[PDB]
Amino acid sequence: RNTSVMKKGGIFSAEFLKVFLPSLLLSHLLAIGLGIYIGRRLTTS
Amino acid sequence: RNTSVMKKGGIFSAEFLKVFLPSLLLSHLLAIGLGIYIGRRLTTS
Numbered sequence: 001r002n003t004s005v006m007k008k009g010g011i012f013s014a015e016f017l018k019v020f021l022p023s024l025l026l027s028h029l030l031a032i033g034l035g036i037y038i039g040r041r042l043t044t045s
Numbered sequence: 046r047n048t049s050v051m052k053k054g055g056i057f058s059a060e061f062l063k064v065f066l067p068s069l070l071l072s073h074l075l076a077i078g079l080g081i082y083i084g085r086r087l088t089t090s
Contacts, residue, residue: 009064016058024056031073035080042081 011017047053056062082090 009060010068011065011066012058016061019057020061022055027073028076031076034082035077035082036087037080038077038082039081041083 020038
């Protein structure tokens with residue numbers, strides 16, 4: 001019956017996703033590292 | 046000409062850094078949250 005998995009936009013090509021993967025991983029790792037640091041500032045500040 | 050005040054982009058994936066640009070920043074906020082969780086996993090969690 002229901003057959004709806006709504007494909008919208010994001011990254012149109014996986015090849016472009018490859019190109020972006022360094023800057024993607026870097027920015028997310030920055031955010032994770034920052035989160036760990038923020039975790040520390042919530043307890044020891 | 047480039048010696049002129051231009052509203053210039055010319056990015057790799059024109060679609061990605063429109064349709065997913067807010068969601069990208071949202072997932073960084075998500076990653077910071079995840080960072081806090083792995084931060085507590087390191088200590089008391």
